[PDB]
Structure formats: C-alpha cells, structure tokens
Amino acid sequence: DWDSRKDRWYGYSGKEYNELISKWERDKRNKEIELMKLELYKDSVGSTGEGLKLNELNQFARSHAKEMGIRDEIEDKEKVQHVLVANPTKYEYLKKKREQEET
Amino acid sequence: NRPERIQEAIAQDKTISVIIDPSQIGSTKPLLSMKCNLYIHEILSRWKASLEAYHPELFLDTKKALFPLLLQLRRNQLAPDLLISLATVLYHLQQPKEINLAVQSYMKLSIIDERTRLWITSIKRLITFEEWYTSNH
Amino acid sequence: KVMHQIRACKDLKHIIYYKFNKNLGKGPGCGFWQPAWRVWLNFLRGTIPLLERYIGNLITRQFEGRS
Amino acid sequence: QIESVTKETVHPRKSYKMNSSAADITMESVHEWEVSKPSLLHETNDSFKGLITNKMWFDVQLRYGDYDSHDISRYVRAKFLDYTTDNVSMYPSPTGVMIGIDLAYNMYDAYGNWFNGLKPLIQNSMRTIMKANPALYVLRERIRKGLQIYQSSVQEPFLNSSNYAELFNNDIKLFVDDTNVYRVTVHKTFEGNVATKAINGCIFTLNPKTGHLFLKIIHTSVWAGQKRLSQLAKWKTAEEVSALVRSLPKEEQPKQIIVTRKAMLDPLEVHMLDFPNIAIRPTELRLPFSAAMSIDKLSDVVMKATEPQMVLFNIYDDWLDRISSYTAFSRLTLLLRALKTNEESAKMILLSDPTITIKSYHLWPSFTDEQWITIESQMRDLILTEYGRKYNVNISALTQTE
RNA sequence: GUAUGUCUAAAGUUAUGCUCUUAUUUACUAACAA
Ligand SMILES: O=P(O)(O)O[C@H]1[C@H](OP(=O)(O)O)[C@@H](OP(=O)(O)O)[C@H](OP(=O)(O)O)[C@@H](OP(=O)(O)O)[C@H]1OP(=O)(O)O
Numbered sequence: 001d002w003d004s005r006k007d008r009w010y011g012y013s014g015k016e017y018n019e020l021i022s023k024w025e026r027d028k029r030n031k032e033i034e035l036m037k038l039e040l041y042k043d044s045v046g047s048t049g050e051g052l053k054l055n056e057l058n059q060f061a062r063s064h065a066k067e068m069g070i071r072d073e074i075e076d077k078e079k080v081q082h083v084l085v086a087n088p089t090k091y092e093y094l095k096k097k098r099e100q101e102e103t
Numbered sequence: 104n105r106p107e108r109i110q111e112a113i114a115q116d117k118t119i120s121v122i123i124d125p126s127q128i129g130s131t132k133p134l135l136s137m138k139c140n141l142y143i144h145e146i147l148s149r150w151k152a153s154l155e156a157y158h159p160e161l162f163l164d165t166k167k168a169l170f171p172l173l174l175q176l177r178r179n180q181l182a183p184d185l186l187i188s189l190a191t192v193l194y195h196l197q198q199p200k201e202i203n204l205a206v207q208s209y210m211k212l213s214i215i216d217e218r219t220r221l222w223i224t225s226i227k228r229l230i231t232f233e234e235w236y237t238s239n240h
Numbered sequence: 241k242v243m244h245q246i247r248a249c250k251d252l253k254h255i256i257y258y259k260f261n262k263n264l265g266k267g268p269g270c271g272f273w274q275p276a277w278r279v280w281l282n283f284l285r286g287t288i289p290l291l292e293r294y295i296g297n298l299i300t301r302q303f304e305g306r307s
Numbered sequence: 308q309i310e311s312v313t314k315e316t317v318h319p320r321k322s323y324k325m326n327s328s329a330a331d332i333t334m335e336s337v338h339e340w341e342v343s344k345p346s347l348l349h350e351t352n353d354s355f356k357g358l359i360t361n362k363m364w365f366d367v368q369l370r371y372g373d374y375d376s377h378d379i380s381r382y383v384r385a386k387f388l389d390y391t392t393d394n395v396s397m398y399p400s401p402t403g404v405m406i407g408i409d410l411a412y413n414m415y416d417a418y419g420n421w422f423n424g425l426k427p428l429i430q431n432s433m434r435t436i437m438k439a440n441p442a443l444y445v446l447r448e449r450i451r452k453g454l455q456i457y458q459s460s461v462q463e464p465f466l467n468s469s470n471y472a473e474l475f476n477n478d479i480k481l482f483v484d485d486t487n488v489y490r491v492t493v494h495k496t497f498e499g500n501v502a503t504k505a506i507n508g509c510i511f512t513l514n515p516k517t518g519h520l521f522l523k524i525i526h527t528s529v530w531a532g533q534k535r536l537s538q539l540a541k542w543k544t545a546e547e548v549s550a551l552v553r554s555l556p557k558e559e560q561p562k563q564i565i566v567t568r569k570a571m572l573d574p575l576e577v578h579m580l581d582f583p584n585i586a587i588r589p590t591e592l593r594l595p596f597s598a599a600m601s602i603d604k605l606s607d608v609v610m611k612a613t614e615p616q617m618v619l620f621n622i623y624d625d626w627l628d629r630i631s632s633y634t635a636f637s638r639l640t641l642l643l644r645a646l647k648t649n650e651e652s653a654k655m656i657l658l659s660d661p662t663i664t665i666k667s668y669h670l671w672p673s674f675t676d677e678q679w680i681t682i683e684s685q686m687r688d689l690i691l692t693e694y695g696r697k698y699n700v701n702i703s704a705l706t707q708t709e
Numbered sequence: 710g711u712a713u714g715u716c717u718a719a720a721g722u723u724a725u726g727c728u729c730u731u732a733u734u735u736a737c738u739a740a741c742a743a
Contacts, residue, residue, distance in 0.1 A: 002375035002376065003375060003376040003377070003381055004381060008268075008389075014344065017391070024400075024401050033108075034108045035177065037108055037109070038112050039174055041109075041113060041116060044170065048477075049478060050475065050476065050477050050631065050632070051474060051475045051476040052476070054631075055473070058472055061706075074702065079702060079703070079704050079709065082709040083684070083688070083691065083709075085706070087641065087687050087709075088637070088638075088684055088687060089630070089634050089635075089638045089683050090677075090679075090683065092630050092631070092634045093676065203620065203668065206619055210551075210554070210617045210619060211617065213554040214616075220554070223554070225556070228558070228559075231556075486742095491739095493738095495738090500737090500739070501737095501738050501739035503739065503741060535740070536740080597742095
C-alpha cells in the first residue's frame with residue numbers, strides 16, 4: 001500500500017481546512033440604456049424514412065428480376081437484365097409509370 | 104427618458120429601405136450596418152408568420168443569439184472583416200437565385216469564438232429558413 | 241558518482257528513522273537533517289574543484305574560441 | 308437551485324498542470340446552499356455544518372497511475388485540500404468539488420463539499436461518463452491499439468451494399484472523402500531524383516439528400532507550414548470537417564458522418580470529440596470519390612483557388628427537381644465510378660453529343676430523361692467493361708453481387 | 710523521414726539524313742497510393 005503511506009494528507013479532521021473557511025468566512029463578512037431596449041423591441045422582451053421508398057424500389061428490383069432472368073441465364077438475362085435493373089435512374093420511371101397505371 | 108427612446112426607435116424601425124448595395128461595401132459605415140440590421144428584422148418577421156409550419160423551438164434561442172448582432176450593428180461594434188463577410192451573406196440572401204451564393208458567403212464568414220459561433224450559427228438558420236420559406240410558399 | 245552520496249543519504253535515513261522510530265510508530269514527520277546535510281556539504285567540497293575546472297573551461301570557450 | 312453554470316476558461320496548461328489548478332466550472336447559486344464538509348463520493352454520511360456557500364466550483368483532475376499509486380480517492384482528496392489552502396491558483400470559493408480520473412486504471416473518484424441531494428447525481432454522472440465518454444472510449448481504444456489486442460466489435464454495422472438503402476432515412480447526414488487533399492506535382496531536380504510538390508486539393512464533403520457538395524479547397528499555403536504531409540492531410544481534413552460541423556446549428560449538425568478512407572476515420576474520431584452526438588460511420592463499401600475531383604468544373608475550381616476558401620455546389624440540381632435524391636445519387640455513383648475507371652471514356656460519354664450544354668450553375672450536362680437513361684446505361688457498360696478487363700469475371704454475376 | 714547544405718529577407722557612393730505523329734520496353738527515381 002504505497003500511495004497510502006505517501007499520502008501527504010493522512011489521518012486527519014479538517015482542522016487546517018476549517019481554519020481556511022474561518023479565514024474566508026471572515027472575508028465574506030468583511031465585504032444598456034437604450035440599446036438594451038433598441039434590440040428587444042423585436043418580440044423578445046424577457047430579460048424507416050425516405051430510404052424505405054428506395055427499399056420499396058429495390059424490392060421492385062426483385063419483381064422485374066423475378067419476371068425475367070433470375071438464375072438460368074448466365075449473361076444473356078441475369079447479367080443483361082441485371083444491368084437494366086436497380087443501377088440506372090430509368091428504373092425510377094419503370095416503377096413510377098407502374099404506380100401511375102396503378103393509380 | 105425611456106418613452107422618447109421608444110418613440111424615436113420604433114419610428115426609426117419603420118423608416119428604412121430593406122436593400123443592400125453590393126458596391127457600397129467598398130465605402131466606409133452605419134448605413135450598411137442599419138440596412139442589414141433592419142433587413143434581419145424582416146427575416147425575423149417573415150419567420151414570425153409561419154412559426155406553426157416551421158419548428159419553433161430553435162428560433163426561441165435564435166432570438167437570444169441574434170441579440171448580440173442587434174447590439175453590434177446599431178453601435179458599429181462589429182468589425183470590418185466580419186461586416187464585409189456578413190453583408191455579403193445578407194445581399195446574396197435577398198435574391199432567390201443566390202442560394203448557392205448564400206451558404207457560400209456564410210461558410211466564408213465562419214471560416215473569442217464562443218458566442219460568436221452561437222450567433223454566426225444562428226445566421227445559418229436564417230438562411231436555412233429563408234431558403235425553405237421561398238420554396239414552400 | 242553522486243549515487244554514492246545519494247546512497248549514503250538513504251543509509252542515514254534508514255539508520256536515523258529506526259533510531260527515531262523505536263517506540264514511535266511509522267510516518268513522515270521526522271526531521272533531523274544533520275548527517276545527510278553533512279554528506280551534501282562534503283559532496284560540494286569534492287565538486288567545487290571539478291566545477292571550477294569544468295565551468296572554467298566552458299566560459300573560456302564562450303569567450304576565447306576553443307583551442 | 309443553480310443560478311448559472313459558467314466555465315472558468317483557464318489556459319490549455321491547466322488540463323495537465325499539476326503544481327496548481329484554476330477551477331474549471333464555477334457555480335453561481337440562486338440561494339445560499341449549505342454545503343456539507345468535504346468528503347469523498349462513496350462516503351455516505353455527509354456532515355451538514357452551518358457553513359453556507361453562494362458559489363461552488365467543479366474541477367477535473369486527470370491522472371495516470373502506476374502499480375504503486377493506484378488509489379485515486381486519497382489522491383483526489385490531497386488535490387482538493389492542496390489547491391484550496393495554497394496561495395497560488397485560488398478558486399472563487401474555498402468550498403467546492405473536485406473530480407479525478409485515473410486514466411491508467413479507469414478508477415474515477417471525487418472529493419469535496421456537497422450541496423444537499425447533489426451527491427447521487429454526481430455518482431451517477433461519473434458512472435455514466437466512465438461507462439461511455441467519447442474521449443475516454445477513444446483513449447481506451449487508442450491504448451488497445453497500442454497493445455494490438457483490439458477486439459473488432461462495432462455496435463453499428465458498416466455501410467455495405469445491403470445497408471446502402473438505409474444510408475439515408477429522413478435524417479440529416481454528411482459524407483466525407485480525404486483522397487484529394489494532398490495532390491502532388493512530380494517534377495525532376497538538379498540531383499536527378501524526384502521532388503514532390505503539393506498542389507491545391509479539396510475536402511469532398513457531400514450530403515446525399517440535398518445534393519449539397521461542400522468542399523473546402525485546400526490552398527497549398529497550409530502545407531507550406533509543415534512536413535510529413537500524408538498524415539497532416541488527414542489532420543487538416545478532420546480539422547476542417549470538425550470546424551464545418553461546429554459552424555452549423557444543432558438541427559443542421561449532421562448525425563451520421565460517413566467516411567470514404569477508413570484510415571482517415573482515426574483522427575476524425577479525435578476532432579469529432581468537440582461534439583459527441585455526431586456518430587461516425589466507417590463505410591465497408593468503397594465509393595469512388597477520388598475520381599469525383601476529375602469532373603471538369605470541379606477540377607477547374609480547385610485550380611482557381613487562391614486561398615483558404617470553400618466553394619460549395621449542388622452535385623446534382625436538375626435531378627433533384629425531377630426525382631428523389633436517391634435516384635440522383637445512383638446516377639452520380641455511376642458517373643463517378645466510370646470516371647474512376649477512365650476519365651477519357653467518361654468525358655467522351657458526357658460530350659458524345661456536343662449539342663447538349665452544361666448549365667452555368669450545374670456541374671453536369673442537363674439531359675432529357677430518356678437520353679439520360681441511355682447515358683446511364685452506357686456508363687454502366689463502361690463499368691462492366693472495366694470489370695471484364697481487370698477482374699476477368701463480369702459475365703456470370705448474380706443480382707446483389709452485380 | 711531525415712542529418713546536412715544552399716537560397717531569400719530592400720534601400721540607390723557624387724566619372725564622361727531529318728521533322729513529325731504516336732504506341733511499347735527497360736532503368737532509375739519518388740515520405741505519392743497500394
Ligand atoms: O527503503 P526505501 O526504498 O528508501 O524507501 C523508504 C522506506 O519505504 P519502503 O520500506 O517501502 O521501501 C521507508 O519505510 P520504512 O522502511 O521506514 O517502513 C519510508 O520511511 P517512513 O516509513 O519513515 O516513511 C521512506 O519514506 P519517506 O521517504 O516518506 O520517509 C521510503 O523512502 P521513499 O519514500 O523515498 O521510497
């Protein structure tokens with residue numbers, strides 16, 4: 001137990017700290033015009049989310065993919081229709097016009 | 104005493120052209136200050152209408168953040184380097200087709216810094232609201 | 241070589257304390273700085289020549305260039 | 308019943324200065340408080356003498372213990388009634404509170420006077436902070452790295468291709484790349500060896516919702532100060548980002564910050580310690596934003612830059628107007644991707660038609676949506692082509708994989 | 710990345726077979742990226 005033995009302060013009531021309070025408690029006992037208004041005239045006088053709609057569109061990516069070219073085709077469909085689903089901005093319109101027909 | 108400070112000020116508050124000349128920045132001072140100071144008051148009033156549409160909680164402290172500027176501007180305590188950057192933001196904020204130029208000017212204003220941050224940040228909310236305000240209108 | 245001096249001081253402390261704390265318990269409150277002080281004086285005695293030479297040469301170099 | 312909680316701004320020295328201490332927080336009261344006699348936190352029987360205080364103070368006292376000085380309570384007590392009862396660095400009241408954190412052992416403790424019903428709050432507070440302060444967590448993680456025992460365990464998963472959807476969710480965000488901060492002109496020397504010289508760069512600082520690409524243009528003047536610039540690039544980056552965040556309001560302070568370079572996360576963590584609410588997101592998915600700066604007008608602006616300035620843009624304008632942000636971002640992603648593969652090809656695709664004109668504000672050429680679609684398709688083909696060339700397996704791709 | 714070494718840092722001294730276009734190698738170098 002080193003730091004206990006080192007402890008410059010050890011084994012004491014605050015006899016020295018009460019004398020500090022006594023010295024300072026004695027010291028306790030011993031002891032705009034328009035601009036304020038100019039500013040305060042104005043009121044103060046106190047003083048998931050949209051990515052779910054993507055997640056639906058990416059679920060709609062599953063639809064066109066599930067229609068044409070899932071697994072059987074290596075390149076001819078599942079890669080070609082892969083290029084034509086989810087990646088391009090046009091896939092917004094492909095769903096949007098299906099929504100517009102659904103309306 | 105205080106009554107004539109109400110009378111003279113509120114009369115002066117309704118007596119201004121809400122315009123910033125982009126060439127008068129080169130000139131030397133209270134004219135650009137009070138132009139901006141009372142242009143901000145219009146940005147305050149346009150807020151005051153659609154406080155139900157917009158989120159009002161942050162504005163209640165935005166007011167307290169703006170209070171320094173008011174005290175700076177009507178006195179000309181605000182520095183030239185700050186003021187030139189500041190007025191540059193407010194001028195671009197007037198034209199609806201300077202929204203790039205608005206936040207552009209705000210970023211170059213921001214880039215001691217304890218309440219200065221607070222109020223300068225509060226100005227960004229004024230652009231943020233105004234940019235939205237002109238959109239949803 | 242001041243380790244010798246330091247060691248001596250340590251030894252003194254060990255000696256002193258355990259003649260100073262026979263019936264008295266442990267703690268830091270012992271003074272009695274005499275013999276250690278003596279040690280340090282003798283160390284200074286030893287070194288005063290050494291530092292006269294060393295710092296002598298040093299300030300000479302500062303003033304006169306080195307040989 | 309506290310009138311004001313003011314921070315007494317001390318020198319930077321105070322943090323680590325040990326001979327003295329000015330009080331960190333000063334506590335102006337509403338009424339007189341009647342604080343207890345000084346005591347430790349876990350010392351329950353706090354004695355309420357007749358002495359009162361109109362004002363307290365809170366001091367922190369960081370320490371780094373050893374195998375011998377590994378109790379904190381004693382130390383903190385010592386510190387308290389050392390600095391009080393010392394005629395250097397006086398506190399406004401001699402009555403106050405002092406916290407001390409043993410960083411070497413995660414042994415918090417605090418000593419000092421106690422306002423009634425305060426102690427529990429402080430105890431709980433310390434418990435909370437120790438459980439998870441950002442700075443302290445960083446420290447532990449730093450030490451952990453130092454000892455190569457880093458348990459790779461994250462609470463929030465990375466931005467992979469699946470979670471890409473849930474990137475954005477009516478939630479204010481920001482996105483960061485530090486790739487083109489330190490660009491170099493390679494030029495010969497008299498000796499014959501290469502000499503690297505810095506060029507102006509950028510801080511690719513994008514917002515996928517609004518499409519507001521901030522980018523503070525790094526003037527070469529900031530490199531002229533120092534050496535070892537690859538690390539310094541990261542630091543300036545994170546610094547700049549931090550500054551930007553500070554500038555913006557609590558609402559517009561972006562929540563989840565995404566970073567391209569996972570190495571540049573490490574100093575960002577540090578400069579994000581200014582504000583703890585801003586979560587960090589190490590992207591698993593590398594996005595092409597090195598090639599982002601090879602867009603014509605962007606590069607132009609970068610070259611133009613004369614000083615420490617930022618010149619923000621809307622990375623996509625017309626696209627927002629037409630469609631939701633995500634759609635725009637996909638197109639953008641494709642474009643940047645293509646650029647990364649090959650700049651010449653990209654530009655060619657963009658300027659295949661010379662009749663089309665890039666709008667004065669816009670970074671990109673304003674196309675009609677069907678021709679736009681075609682362009683996108685072409686770009687995609689370019690990417691696939693690149694893959695075929697390099698990866699040599701671009702034909703038999705699964706959907707998600709693709 | 711360095712040792713180290715140069716450089717700058719403001720005041721006026723009184724005289725009348727080839728050119729071309731390119732693509733490829735190899736080498737070296739590179740506190741630039743991987
Ligand atoms: O033997 P040293 O390495 O010189 O250390 C001694 C020794 O402490 P350790 O026994 O733990 O090493 C003394 O302890 P005792 O043998 O007397 O029990 C202790 O003396 P006190 O007990 O009188 O304190 C003294 O401490 P101090 O210097 O405060 O007198 C301390 O020296 P260090 O503190 O320099 O280690």
